[PDB]
């Protein structure tokens, strides 16, 4: 039961900085963006039911 290895993986993981991005809207505007993307935009869906984060 050696405690020598503790935080080894969090220690040896390469440190990648967070990229600077445009701030996201909040409140009613974020909900409006969600509603427009999911119910007003019909182009992406031809009827195959793909997930919003499908990267394949």
């Amino acid at each position: 039961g050696s405690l020598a290895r503790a935080g080894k993986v969090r220690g040896q993981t390469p440190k990648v900085a967070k990229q600077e991005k445009k701030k996201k809207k909040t409140g009613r505007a974020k909900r409006r963006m969600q509603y427009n993307r999911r119910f007003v935009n019909v182009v992406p869906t031809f009827g195959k039911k793909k997930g919003p984060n499908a990267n394949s």
Binding site: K48, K49, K50, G51, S56
Partner: peptide, 30 residues
């Protein structure tokens, strides 16, 4: 990636649960 083929192949593997979900998406609004 065929959702039906993925289900028929590796429904019984580590990815069976996620593959089942992808199959249900292809068939109906699951």
């Amino acid at each position: 990636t065929d959702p039906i083929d993925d289900f028929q192949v590796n429904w019984n593997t580590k990815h069976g649960s996620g593959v089942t979900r992808e199959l249900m998406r292809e068939l109906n609004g699951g």
